[PDB]
Write a protein that binds this ligand. Structure first.
Ligand SMILES: [Mg+2]
Ligand SMILES: [Zn+2]
Ligand SMILES: [Zn+2]
Lengths: 1364, 347, 243
RNA sequence: CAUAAAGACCAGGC
DNA sequence: GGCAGTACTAGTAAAGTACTTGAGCTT
DNA sequence: AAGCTCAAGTACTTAAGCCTGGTCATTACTAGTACTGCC
């Protein structure tokens, strides 16, 4: 049929309920156990819904097919099939309407905010209880405590009466029709901004976001009350027995039978037609009946005998109160599926799978029944259902003719990224295991000791052919995460190919190629009789490749034959051998990138098959078996062991003699063993590359197969050091290895580190889909739909250097992203009007780094499209190497590329524990090479002491040559003296910086005069004497040594000019008021003229740090779920000058003085926080202050929109880049908008200031009024950063946020607004069961085929349509 | 009965007996669990009890958990360790004098280990009475120091008390990392009785004690003269009277032949005593599910050759020729129960 | 051989060289001198492939001692019919390299084999021997689960396994975001509708595949019906709206 | 072609 | 022959987020 | 006296796949009724 545009959710009306429903259900009449025919006109009826049998009547008058259309005369019942009983509906006329508890027990009360009653209190007072018939009137201004009084002015206490305000909900409609809404609603926009009492504006700003939902295109408030109860479908609740005398029925059979027996009781017992003040007893029973259909558990559950479990309500099937939400997303059982063991198919290719042959007898049978009638196996369709359903030995031939061109769906259950479900052709293989391709085994985090996978069967020819060009594994060779291929030649294939291009060593080991040139023939010809060349060293004497293996087979040559045959085996089945030269050991994953970029994908398939065969086949031809004698012990091992064991005796004698202390021996015992593994390590890796090069254990770790630089050292030499389960290091090193006699003690020590890795994956192998789930729930509506937008608003500046991992890294963040404008940084390269950059362009953006500070790039987080993201701002990453195509769910492939590398991360606990590091500094900066000094964010000035003194910390002191390359990375603290400035050339081995690692001098930046401020003898200052200077000077007392009353007094050397006014710092509006800490050195008089750079005070001691950076999956849960870190850094609320307050060992202070207030802006700093701020130039707002993380909520408030979108996508990469996984910036940014999708505007343009609405609608509102025409409006905002557990909790859709346990507050929000749910997302399209938009479902994907016969065929009616 | 049956079937602490192996049986009874009733820690915590403590030296083998959903939660119990009387584990230590090692053993408490220094099992000893070199490395309670022979008070019994019976059968445990010694101890936990049982070509000294000490090998009650031998029974004619070929105080022995265990396997007991063999109290009479004569024989010995064959042995795959299925060398017996419980009907 | 550098388990190569040199270390002792006691045909060929390499005086010889002696100098190690090895105090590389230069046939562990496929003179003599391997049991997980047409539940329309009919694979949520992560629009659509849930899809599909043509395009699913009737009976209402 | 429920808890593979 | 007792059988007793809210401090 | 914001107090949260195994019990207490024994 047609493509459905969108669905619309609204409240049910009886003028609409009686449209799809016919008849009237009056009694609880079900189908008896004997006959299936309907009994009476109840829930199961033939006049209402339909008959049961084919053509028979209820009475039994006419049963023959003679009367098929005409009804009977005495009892006219039209008869059809029993299918029409399912679709047709009936409605139950309830005499009194009832409430919907989703609109009641929910905290945003829909009848408490709009209609000003208590939101929780009066609902637990009126509804179930006995308070009786407020609307309107003229008795009581007070509107809260209902009985007695209650709207608008008469009379409170004693007796009064026994005002609607009724129990239940038959007249809450009458509250919603009058409370007087006009005295509750034009007047809302005046009471907020006009009246100065903010109690009236903080009570009335909450109650418009539900008030204006009914004023707009949504419905009226008078339909929240359930009047008419629609029935449940008849065949949806069958009543068949289970076995013998037991039953398995739904829990709705006990609940629809009660509501109908509590309906006519109010009609005719109760024949009145009374005032409503009389009756109580029925709606206390009927409302009790319908509440079990609404919700059980929020006040009172509904239980059965010997069952302390609530009855399974209609909401409890969705939200899962009993724990069946963990069963709904556990999966729906596939009718065409199987499971068996997995194994390896080498000769199997990337197009095919090898599955067992008995499973195909069962799972493939509906395709067999349509094949048996053409052949001589079976005759009809009925007799074929009792032969092919079992073990049959004839169907073996006729099964394979269907599976010529019908691939299936392979399925491994850790379906993390895109390639968790792949498509392959079935090959019928004997045995019980499925065959898995070895290149595929990098996409499947698995091994072959017990892993078991699943399989599925594609049914229609529509879904069959998309399992060949879109789902097949060798089509999508690239990762969703980055541009690197996941599928890669891993271990056995690279062993023979790695050994193939090698050269043995007796004397000489160069590389040689002679197919082609002529000089190396005569050059390497005469060596066969000499010592330079043999039968395995530098020889080749022949023209071409062909007879070189002829000469090599007859024992004359050994080497450069595998290099000669490798150069023609792989490029014979594929042209373009100009790229087919770099195999290597680290270029094994790079060939599947550049061979896809230069050549096509059909090159890549057979290109992987040739390398597959010549890789896995010749590894047995080499036969690289590891033995015990292959692990060559270095000769330098026992000498370093003998030197390390002879020093602990001397150091122990030093401790016994008593001339030394414990501290200077304890660090020596660990020093002589901490450097021994470095000296013995730098003795097997250089021994086997010069003597044997053909060693098995050396080549299987030197190559990319499976090797690390730490697991080989544990066997070969000595495993160095093992730590405690806390993290503190063990003072006793271990010296025996896996090769020698390893005692019980060192094996017992190794278990302390062996328990972390396997106990890490203990509870991490019960469960694998919530780090995926909580990140795909938020960004599910991210679909590529691009119509030539090209936006410029919200342009993002990218810093040339990232925020920082430890103290000062050097990395770049741009990959495959479009450019914003014309930027000419290189001398040869140039980026034009917006173009998708390559992987080569990040090296051009990283090369000229001393000229660029902001890379102009269009971002994902700022785009005009409300639901989706355009093709330009997103990039290239779809499945493959070219541009993104239309219709891609770029939000789920982004989040699942974050869920997959989190498996290898260290999981200790979700909220930060600790680590261990050491802070050190040296005042010895000596440049190694030549070049110039590059300085950034510094204000150098020459003082009166003749020293070029800086005024800033975090100064980038790097050696930048004439080509602009980072060669050094040094740290310059505050108060340093540079020998040369910015731009001056230096020489090799020259000191360019020198300071004191004892003093951080308080150094000024402006000139003028020094005025004594808040310094009184006996309160803050006291005449003391230093220990190094010797000059008696005025010394400020500490914070704890001060007298009573001087706790608020802060001393200051206030800098004034000659006129007495305040001297502002150049750049900002900050007065120069530097505070003097306690125990400072003030060698300066009063009123004397100073200069910019003069030392005011000094800091005698330095401390701080020792507890720092988290790392791991706990930081992933810390950054995606925006929470409080373990190490908070008090970020500066105002941007300006910074200067230390105190320096005492107890507490350190920090004060900023913006314009007027100086002293109340104090920030306390403990000794754990490492001080990263200086006493000089202004800092930005939101800048870091300590060695710790930041809060994403406050840095959102302070710095701006270029901060949280670049701090949350960079710091999460500081975790994954440590383990080695490279995740692109494109796949983190689509969830940053979804945490930013709601905010709060400050200027009312269309709605009020506190709304909390979405921002993609507000971007159009500021777009059309400011950009095009008609009175531009400054509709600015204030952003709101949330967590992913709350940003997905309140969405636009109602089934997108129904993946939580809070389905009460969402369905009412999508219910009262009348919100048309345009199903853009794909998550919101599987639960509803409709057609996927991203594939063939988008409206651009509409076309039809045409051949030449059906091209000349419609030419005849259009000539026929011409008249004579 | 309503409180003791609830622990017997529905409890966290009590699970099904793993009977695919007598070694799996003996590692199942001697098992620790960190999870019990609700009055203790939960499944979600445990990161201070999974990690082994340095006092646990020769008292629990720290690598004896199964590999799967729970690592470090089980941690089964070592060889010479034993709950003595009141819950206090007391592992044996050889009481050694000044220079002569006395063959007696003593059960030392965990708080009493900190009061004496104990020597090690990797030291060379001639028979029981001499000491090779005056400086030998020793451990007091976790720290390392060099002591002389006059200071040594206690000594370890052997290098076997540090491991469990799943790891004492592991030959080269000093050469393997613990990360795969855990699974190497769990391969014996998931074994199966094969047809052609073959004892390992490397012996340890524990393959013969599991069959005798557990309920695996039939042990006679009193020695006599064997008169007849069958597969289902072994009749023993014990001469309680004057010696005659006329029969005597017969103790018939029923050998459980072919029944179903918990792990869908079979427990077999094949006789070995021939006609006319006087048995001793303690002599073997029949075999076990995998035992050859009295020793444990889980798997087999086949010709191995380390080579990447062609692709197939990619991660953890095992390749084998056509001969392995032509003979019934790994053909095991799998027994499945089809149980169905009787009820009533409406008619 | 690549399971050795990553998974640090060199002791299986210790057992491989050991089971290779079982003819020449300590099964050297009980294999022949005790006995070929049951078989009188091995006491002619095995008696000369034994003394050609291995000549340690700790390890006792055939030519001095008869059959009845070892059946007195090796009654002490009869329980060790092959070699004996304790856990952490066992073999040593100074003893292994001393007892493997002995052991017939090779020297230092490695020997030139021949390929079973190519045949030729095999480069780099390899570590071979007799490893004591172990077969794991066959739990019912390893039994093949084959389901095409079984029963369905009452309150839901999901399949069900059990005694006769086998269990069906559930289609979990990460499996939904894989085909959802793909451009395949109809496979995931029929996966939750025609496979599992719809009573109108599994019947019409099975009636059209047996004809030879395609199955009818999916209309209403059963999740849309059941969830929709869960919505309609409450105060809210969901209604499908056309173009 | 129709029947073997649902749920709880435990064990197991990775 | 009638009444009462009793047995059988069918209904039936870690560690965080947001969010609230009470209280302390100013026009 | 109104009121305005701020901080502690509080309730509530969701617990990283799927897969089979076996098992185990679907409730034991109260009320009415019918049967049987005794007076
Ligand atoms: Mg596995
Ligand atoms: Zn009729
Ligand atoms: Zn855009």
């Amino acid at each position: 049929t047609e493509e459905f545009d969108a669905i619309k959710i609204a409240l049910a009306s009886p003028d609409m309920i009686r449209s799809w429903s016919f008849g009237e259900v009056k009694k609880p009449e079900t189908i008896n156990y004997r006959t299936f025919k309907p009994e009476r006109d109840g829930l199961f009826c033939a006049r209402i819904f339909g008959p049961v049998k084919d053509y028979e009547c209820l009475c039994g008058k006419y049963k023959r097919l003679k009367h098929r259309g005409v009804i009977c005369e005495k009892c006219g019942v039209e008869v059809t099939q029993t299918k029409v009983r399912r679709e047709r509906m009936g409605h139950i006329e309830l005499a009194s309407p009832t409430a919907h508890i989703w609109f009641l027990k929910s905290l945003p009360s829909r009848i408490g905010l709009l209609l000003d009653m208590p939101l929780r209190d009066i609902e637990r007072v009126l509804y179930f209880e006995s308070y009786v018939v407020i609307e309107g009137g003229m008795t009581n201004l007070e509107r809260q405590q209902i009985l007695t009084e209650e709207q608008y002015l008469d009379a409170l206490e004693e007796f009064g009466d026994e005002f609607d305000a009724k129990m239940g909900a038959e007249a809450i409609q009458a509250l919603l029709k009058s409370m007087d809404l006009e005295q509750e609603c034009e007047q809302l926009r005046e009471e907020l901004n006009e009246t100065n009492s903010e109690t009236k504006r903080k009570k009335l700003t909450k109650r418009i976001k539900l008030l204006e939902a009914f004023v707009q295109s949504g419905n009226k408030p008078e339909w929240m009350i359930l009047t008419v109860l629609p029935v449940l479908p008849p065949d949806l609740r069958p009543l068949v027995p289970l076995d013998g005398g037991r039953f398995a029925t739904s829990d709705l059979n006990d609940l629809y039978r009660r509501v109908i027996n509590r309906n006519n009781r109010l009609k005719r017992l109760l024949d009145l037609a009374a005032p409503d003040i009389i009756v109580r007893n029925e709606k206390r029973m009927l409302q009790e009946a319908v509440d079990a259909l609404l919700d059980n558990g929020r006040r009172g559950r509904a239980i059965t005998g010997s069952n302390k479990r609530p009855l399974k309500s209609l909401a409890d099937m969705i939200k899962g109160k009993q724990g069946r939400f963990r069963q709904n997303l556990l999966g729906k059982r596939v009718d065409y599926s199987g499971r068996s063991v997995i194994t390896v198919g080498p000769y199997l290719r990337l197009h095919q799978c090898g599955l067992p042959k008995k499973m195909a007898l069962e799972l493939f049978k509906p395709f067999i029944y349509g094949k048996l009638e053409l052949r001589g196996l079976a005759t009809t369709i009925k007799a074929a259902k009792k032969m092919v359903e079992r073990e049959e030995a004839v169907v073996w031939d006729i099964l394979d003719e269907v599976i010529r061109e019908h691939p299936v769906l392979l399925n491994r259950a850790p379906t993390l990224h895109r390639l968790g479900i792949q498509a392959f052709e079935p090959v019928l293989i004997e045995g019980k295991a499925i065959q898995l391709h070895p290149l595929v085994c990098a996409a499947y985090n698995a091994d072959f000791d017990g892993d078991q996978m699943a399989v599925h069967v594609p049914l229609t020819l529509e879904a069959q052919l998309e399992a060949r060009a879109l789902m097949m594994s060798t089509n999508n060779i690239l990762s969703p995460a980055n541009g690197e291929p996941i599928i890669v030649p891993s271990q056995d294939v690279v062993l023979g190919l790695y050994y193939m291009t090698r050269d043995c060593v007796n004397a000489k080991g160069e590389g040689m190629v002679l197919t082609g040139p002529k000089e190396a023939e005569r050059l390497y010809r005469s060596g066969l009789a000499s010592l330079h060349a043999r039968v395995k060293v530098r020889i080749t004497e022949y023209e071409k490749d062909a007879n070189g293996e002829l000469v090599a087979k007859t024992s004359l040559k050994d080497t450069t034959v595998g290099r000669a045959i490798l150069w023609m085996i792989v490029p014979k089945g594929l042209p373009y051998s100009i790229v087919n030269q770099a195999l290597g050991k680290k270029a094994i994953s790079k060939m599947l990138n550049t061979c896809y970029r230069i050549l096509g994908l059909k090159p890549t398939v057979i290109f992987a098959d040739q390398i597959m065969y010549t890789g896995f086949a010749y590894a047995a031809r080499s036969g690289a078996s590891v033995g015990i004698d292959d692990m060559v012990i270095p000769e330098k091992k026992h000498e370093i062991i003998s030197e390390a064991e002879a020093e602990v005796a001397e150091i122990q004698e030093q401790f016994q003699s008593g001339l030394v202390t414990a501290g200077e021996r304890y660090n020596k015992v660990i020093d002589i063993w901490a450097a021994a593994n470095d000296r013995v390590s730098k003795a097997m890796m250089d021994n086997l590359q010069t003597e044997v090069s053909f060693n098995s254990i050396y080549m299987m770790a030197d190559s990319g197969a499976r090797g690390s630089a730490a697991q080989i050292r544990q066997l070969a030499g000595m495993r160095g050091l093992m730590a405690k389960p806390d993290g503190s290091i063990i003072e006793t090193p271990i010296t025996a290895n896996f090769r020698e006699g390893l005692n019980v003690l060192q094996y017992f020590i190794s278990t302390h580190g062996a328990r972390k890795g396997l106990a890490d994956t203990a509870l991490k192998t019960a469960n694998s889909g919530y780090l995926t789930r909580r990140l795909v729930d938020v960004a599910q509506d991210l679909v590529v739909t691009e119509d030539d937008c090209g936006t410029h608003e919200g342009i993002m500046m990218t810093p040339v250097i990232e925020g920082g991992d430890v103290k000062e890294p050097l990395r770049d963040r741009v990959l495959g992203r479009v450019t914003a404008e014309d930027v000419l940084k290189p001398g040869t390269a140039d980026i034009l009007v917006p173009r998708n950059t390559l992987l080569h362009e990040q090296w051009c953006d990283l090369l000229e780094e001393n000229s660029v500070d902001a890379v102009k790039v269009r971002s994902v987080v700022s785009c005009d499209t409300d639901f989706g993201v355009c093709a330009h701002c997103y990039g290239r990453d779809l499945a493959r190497g070219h541009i993104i195509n239309k219709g891609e769910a770029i939000g789920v492939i982004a989040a699942q590329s974050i869920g997959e590398p989190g498996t290898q991360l260290t999981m200790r606990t979700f909220h930060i524990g600790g680590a261990a590091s050491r802070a050190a500094a040296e005042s010895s900066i000596q440049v190694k090479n030549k070049g110039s000094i590059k300085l950034s964010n510094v204000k150098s000035v020459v003082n009166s002491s003749g020293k070029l003194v800086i005024t800033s910390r975090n100064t980038e002191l790097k050696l930048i040559d004439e080509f602009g390359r980072t060669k050094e990375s040094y740290k310059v603290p505050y108060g340093a003296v540079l020998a040369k400035g910015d731009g001056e050339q230096v020489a090799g081995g020259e000191t360019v910086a020198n300071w004191d690692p004892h003093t951080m001098p308080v150094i000024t930046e402006v000139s003028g005069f020094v005025r004594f401020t808040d310094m009184i003898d006996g309160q803050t200052i006291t005449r003391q004497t230093d220990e190094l200077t010797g000059l008696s000077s005025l010394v400020v007392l500490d914070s704890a040594e001060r007298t009573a009353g001087g706790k608020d007094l802060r001393p200051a050397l206030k800098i004034v000019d000659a006129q007495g006014n305040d001297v502002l710092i150049p750049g900002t509006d900050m007065p120069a008021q530097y505070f003097l800490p306690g125990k400072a050195i003030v060698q300066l008089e009063d009123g004397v003229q100073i200069s910019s750079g003069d030392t005011l005070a000094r800091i005698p001691q330095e401390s701080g740090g020792t507890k720092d950076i988290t790392g791991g999956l706990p930081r992933v849960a810390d950054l995606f779920e925006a929470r409080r870190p373990k190490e908070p850094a008090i970020l500066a609320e105002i941007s300006g000058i910074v200067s230390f307050g105190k320096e005492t060992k107890g507490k350190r202070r920090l004060v900023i003085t913006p314009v007027d207030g100086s002293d109340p802006y104090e920030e306390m700093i403990p000794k754990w926080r490492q001080l990263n701020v200086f006493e000089g130039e202004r800092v930005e707002r939101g800048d870091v202050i300590s060695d710790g993380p930041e809060a994403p909520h406050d840095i959102l408030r302070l710095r701006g929109v270029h901060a949280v979108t670049r701090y949350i996508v960079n710091e999460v990469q500081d975790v994954y880049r440590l383990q080695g996984v490279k995740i692109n910036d494109k796949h983190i940014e689509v969830i940053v908008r979804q945490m930013l999708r709601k905010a709060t505007i400050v200027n009312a343009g269309s709605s009020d200031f506190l709304e909390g609405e979405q921002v993609e609608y507000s971007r159009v509102k500021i777009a059309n009024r400011e950009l095009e025409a008609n009175g531009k409006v400054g509709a600015t905002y204030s952003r709101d950063l949330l967590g992913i557990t709350k940003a997905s909790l309140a969405t636009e859709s109602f089934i997108s946020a129904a993946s939580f346990q809070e389905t009460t507050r969402v369905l009412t929000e999508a219910a009262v607004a009348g919100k048309r749910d345009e199903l853009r997302g794909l998550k919101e399209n599987v639960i509803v069961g409709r057609l996927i938009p991203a594939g063939t479902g988008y409206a651009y994907h509409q076309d039809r085929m045409r051949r030449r016969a059906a091209g000349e065929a419609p030419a005849a009616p259009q000539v026929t349509a011409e008249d004579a | 009965s309503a409180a003791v049956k609830e622990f017997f079937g529905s409890s966290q602490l009590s699970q099904f007996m793993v009977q695919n192996n007598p070694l799996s049986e003996i590692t199942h009874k001697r098992r620790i669990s960190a999870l019990g009733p609700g009055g203790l820690t939960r499944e979600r915590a445990g990161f201070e009890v999974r990690d082994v403590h340095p006092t646990h030296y020769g008292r629990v083998c720290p690598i004896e958990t199964p590999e799967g959903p729970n690592i470090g939660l089980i941690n089964s119990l070592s060889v010479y360790a034993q709950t003595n009387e009141y819950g206090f584990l007391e592992t044996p230590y050889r009481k050694v004098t000044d220079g002569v090692v006395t063959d007696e053993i003593h059960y030392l408490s965990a708080i009493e280990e900190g009061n004496y220094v104990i020597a090690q099992a990797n030291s060379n000893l001639d028979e029981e009475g001499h000491f090779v070199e005056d400086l030998v490395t020793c451990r007091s309670k976790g720290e390392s120091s060099l002591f002389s022979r006059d200071q040594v008070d206690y000594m370890d019994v052997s290098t076997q008390q540090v491991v469990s019976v799943g790891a004492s059968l592991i030959p080269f445990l000093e050469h393997d990392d613990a990360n795969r010694a855990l699974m190497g101890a769990n391969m014996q936990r998931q074994a199966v009785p094969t047809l052609r049982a073959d004892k390992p070509l490397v012996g340890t000294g524990m393959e013969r004690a599991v069959a005798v000490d557990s309920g695996v090998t039939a042990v006679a009650k009193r020695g006599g003269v064997v008169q007849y031998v069958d597969a289902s029974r072994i009749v023993i004619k014990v001469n309680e009277d004057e010696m005659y070929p006329g029969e005597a105080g017969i103790d018939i022995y029923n050998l459980t032949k072919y029944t179903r265990s918990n792990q869908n396997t079979c427990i077999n007991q094949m006789p070995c005593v021939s006609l006319g063999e006087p048995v001793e109290r303690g002599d073997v009479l029949a075999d076990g599910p995998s035992t050859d004569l009295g020793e444990l024989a889980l798997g087999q010995n086949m010709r191995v050759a380390f080579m990447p064959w062609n692709g197939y042995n990619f991660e953890d795959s095992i390749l084998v020729s056509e001969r392995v299925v032509q003979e019934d060398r790994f053909t095991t017996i799998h027994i499945q129960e089809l149980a169905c419980v009787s009820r009533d009907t409406k008619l | 051989p690549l399971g050795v550098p990553s998974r640090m388990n060199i002791g299986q190569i210790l057992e491989t060289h050991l089971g290779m040199a079982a003819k020449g270390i300590g099964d050297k002792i009980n294999a022949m001198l005790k006995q070929q006691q049951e078989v009188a045909k091995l006491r002619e060929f095995i008696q000369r492939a034994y003394d050609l390499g291995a000549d340690v005086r700790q390890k006792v010889d055939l030519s001095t001692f008869s059959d009845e002696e070892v059946m007195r100098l090796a009654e002490n190690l009869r329980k060790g019919m092959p070699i004996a090895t304790p856990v952490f105090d066992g073999a040593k590389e100074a003893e292994i390299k001393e007892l493997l230069k002995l052991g017939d046939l090779p020297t230092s562990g490695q020997i030139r084999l021949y390929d079973g496929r190519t045949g030729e003179q095999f480069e780099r003599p390899v570590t071979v021997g007799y490893m004591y391997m172990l077969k794991l049991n066959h739990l019912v997980d390893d039994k093949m689960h084959a389901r095409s047409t079984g029963s369905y539940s009452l309150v839901t329309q999901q399949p069900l396994g059990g005694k006769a009919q086998f269990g069906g694979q559930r289609f979990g949520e990460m499996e939904v975001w894989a085909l959802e992560a793909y451009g395949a629009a109809y496979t995931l659509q029929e996966m939750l509708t025609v496979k599992s849930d719809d009573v109108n899809g599994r019947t019409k599909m099975y009636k059209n595949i047996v004809d030879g043509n395609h199955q009818m395009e999916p209309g209403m699913p059963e999740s849309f019906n059941v969830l929709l009737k869960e919505i309609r009976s409450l105060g809210i209402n969901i209604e499908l709206e056309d173009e």
